[PDB]
Amino acid sequence: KYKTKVPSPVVKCCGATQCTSKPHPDYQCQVFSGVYPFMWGGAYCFCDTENTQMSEAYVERSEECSIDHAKAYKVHTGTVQAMVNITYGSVSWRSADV
Amino acid sequence: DLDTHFTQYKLARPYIADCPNCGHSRCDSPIAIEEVRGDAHAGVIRIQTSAMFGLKTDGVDLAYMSFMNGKTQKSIKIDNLHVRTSAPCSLVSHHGYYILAQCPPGDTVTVGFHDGPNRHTCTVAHKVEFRPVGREKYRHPPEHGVELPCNRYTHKRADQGHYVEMHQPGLVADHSLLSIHSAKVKITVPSGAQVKYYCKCPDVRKGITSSDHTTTCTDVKQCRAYLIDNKKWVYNSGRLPRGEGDTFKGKLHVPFVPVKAK
Amino acid sequence: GLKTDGVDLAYMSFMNGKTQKSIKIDNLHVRTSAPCSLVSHHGYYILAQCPPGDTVTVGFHDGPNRHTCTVAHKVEFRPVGREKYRHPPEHGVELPCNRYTHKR
Amino acid sequence: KAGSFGDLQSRTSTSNDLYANTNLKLQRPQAGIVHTPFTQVPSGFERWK
Amino acid sequence: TVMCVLANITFPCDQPPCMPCCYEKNPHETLTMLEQNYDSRAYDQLLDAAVKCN
Ligand SMILES: *[C@@H]1O[C@H](CO)[C@@H](O)[C@H](O)[C@H]1NC(C)=O
Numbered sequence: 001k002y003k004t005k006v007p008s009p010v011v012k013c014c015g016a017t018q019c020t021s022k023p024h025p026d027y028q029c030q031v032f033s034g035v036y037p038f039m040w041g042g043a044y045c046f047c048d049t050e051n052t053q054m055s056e057a058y059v060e061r062s063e064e065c066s067i068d069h070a071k072a073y074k075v076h077t078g079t080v081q082a083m084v085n086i087t088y089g090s091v092s093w094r095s096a097d098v
Numbered sequence: 099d100l101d102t103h104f105t106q107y108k109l110a111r112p113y114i115a116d117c118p119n120c121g122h123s124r125c126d127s128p129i130a131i132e133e134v135r136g137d138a139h140a141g142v143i144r145i146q147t148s149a150m151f152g153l154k155t156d157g158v159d160l161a162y163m164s165f166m167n168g169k170t171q172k173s174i175k176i177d178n179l180h181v182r183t184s185a186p187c188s189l190v191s192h193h194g195y196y197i198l199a200q201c202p203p204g205d206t207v208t209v210g211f212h213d214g215p216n217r218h219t220c221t222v223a224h225k226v227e228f229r230p231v232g233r234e235k236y237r238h239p240p241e242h243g244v245e246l247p248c249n250r251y252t253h254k255r256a257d258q259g260h261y262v263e264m265h266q267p268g269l270v271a272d273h274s275l276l277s278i279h280s281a282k283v284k285i286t287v288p289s290g291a292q293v294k295y296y297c298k299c300p301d302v303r304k305g306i307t308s309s310d311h312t313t314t315c316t317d318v319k320q321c322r323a324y325l326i327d328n329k330k331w332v333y334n335s336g337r338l339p340r341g342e343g344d345t346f347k348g349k350l351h352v353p354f355v356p357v358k359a360k
Numbered sequence: 361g362l363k364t365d366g367v368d369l370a371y372m373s374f375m376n377g378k379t380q381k382s383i384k385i386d387n388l389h390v391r392t393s394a395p396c397s398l399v400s401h402h403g404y405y406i407l408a409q410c411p412p413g414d415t416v417t418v419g420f421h422d423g424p425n426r427h428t429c430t431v432a433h434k435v436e437f438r439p440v441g442r443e444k445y446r447h448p449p450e451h452g453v454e455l456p457c458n459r460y461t462h463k464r
Numbered sequence: 465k466a467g468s469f470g471d472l473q474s475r476t477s478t479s480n481d482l483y484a485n486t487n488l489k490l491q492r493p494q495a496g497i498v499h500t501p502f503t504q505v506p507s508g509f510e511r512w513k
Numbered sequence: 514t515v516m517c518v519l520a521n522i523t524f525p526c527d528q529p530p531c532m533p534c535c536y537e538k539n540p541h542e543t544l545t546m547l548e549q550n551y552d553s554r555a556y557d558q559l560l561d562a563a564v565k566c567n
């Protein structure tokens with residue numbers, strides 16, 4: 001399973017900050033313009049329309065990848081081994097691997 | 099063991115983050131659900147919230163949650179701290195930002211708590227599936243049967259390598275730091291905490307102040323002020339603003355990592 | 361939201377016989393199959409956000425006493441649009457829809 | 465592909481390449497809200513399971 | 514021993530400079546040192562050492 005890591009967006013109040021491609025799996029950055037953010041303090045950025053938000057997101061392995069995961073394997077050919085029991089005459093069972 | 103990881107969470111502060119369903123409407127909530135992880139078996143889920151559990155503003159005590167009433171960082175005793183998907187869930191544990199709970203199948207996840215009269219609740223949609231282990235699709239874990247391997251969330255640290263990324267809070271916005279004084283507007287630094295003001299009196303005025311500073315201007319709604327506190331960490335959440343040069347990460351431990359159990 | 365003498369939006373009034381007694385809203389729980397979120401309460405009416413269910417129960421506490429009433433109205437969740445979501449999403453598209461107003 | 469199997473492929477359990485094709489598109493934040501909405505194809509691992 | 518960096522100071526990771534308590538003395542400095550040592554292979558030792566306060 002994947003985990004979409006979403007870092008904190010970069011909100012520039014009266015500016016246009018722009019994307020910079022980062023070496024990350026399925027990395028997406030977008031620069032949505034005209035955002036008037038509201039937060040608990042209320043009025044996050046001054047400029048009514050000339051506000052920019054840079055949102056980025058990238059896929060990682062989920063935390064559970066170390067416990068459940070599918071291993072893809074190429075098989076070609078191998079040893080054939082077997083455990084064998086032998087008795088002969090009065091000798092009892094020996095049961096050794098070959 | 100338990101003490102040292104709870105000590106370790108003291109660098110992290112709760113935060114107020116946007117939440118879809120607060121009850122009435124969508125608001126900024128102290129208990130905002132960041133992530134629900136529900137890929138374990140037998141209906142055990144891990145909810146990352148915006149509130150610290152088991153911490154007190156001065157120390158650790160596993161009966162206290164801490165959460166922001168604004169910029170106050172107030173700490174209470176866990177009054178209800180209830181998790182429910184379609185019927186109430188059983189709080190298996192709570193550590194740091196995270197709570198581990200056994201939940202029935204559902205189409206919502208709500209976490210909420212009481213601070214005296216006040217009730218803080220946050221619901222996200224996050225459909226939760228009960229995941230039977232084995233070759234019979236049972237709906238609730240049986241009292242007898244067969245012990246089969248299964249994925250469960252630990253309550254004790256296994257030898258951690260699962261980390262949560264943390265950063266210093268950026269420019270926490272607050273307009274209670276603005277007031278009208280005489281005829282101009284006043285920026286009051288609460289205590290030993292910097293404040294960035296951006297005051298568009300018609301000339302663009304701005305700066306960072308460690309003390310009270312009247313900024314001229316006339317109305318309160320020209321003088322947007324931002325609290326800068328860099329003494330705590332917050333989770334690298336998509337619901338929290340960040341600034342341009344705010345890259346520095348923090349790398350705290352995650353409790354309740356997945357493990358294979360029976 | 362009424363008091364025997366006046367209005368105050370923390371008080372319910374109900375008849376304990378012929379007494380017409382007024383209390384503080386103690387729980388005022390509304391539940392269809394899980395508890396609902398009381399958006400508002402005004403006059404005889406309460407407005408609540410509810411999960412899909414087959415019953416509607418309204419109840420309240422007057423100290424030790426619990427007054428509860430369950431009717432068998434089936435509540436259907438009604439998605440707006442062309443996707444059958446079960447709980448309102450956090451993001452998406454703002455589409456026109458029918459809602460109960462919360463003041464007037 | 466985006467959602468069948470091998471949508472997230474890593475050479476080892478601790479590798480850093482982590483090829484991942486999930487069709488992840490970032491979406492416009494809702495008015496007022498500082499959040500980072502995104503849309504993604506559901507995991508092909510669980511679809512396989 | 515693994516080495517970690519704080520500004521231009523370089524120190525053994527398990528033994529940060531302060532020792533009795535490195536969050537009460539200067540909380541910002543401890544945080545900034547933990548951020549500077551993000552990629553260290555022995556970051557866990559630092560996080561215990563910094564958080565240690567009896
Ligand atoms: C054959 O060997 C097995 C061990 O591989 C042993 O348990 C068994 O007794 C042997 N066979 C007989 C008839 O005893």
Ligand SMILES: *[C@@H]1O[C@H](CO)[C@@H](O)[C@H](O)[C@H]1NC(C)=O
Pocket residue numbers: 520521522
């Ligand atoms: C650099 O290291 C020297 C030697 O310990 C010290 O005197 C100086 O203060 C350090 N500079 C900074 C900026 O930390």
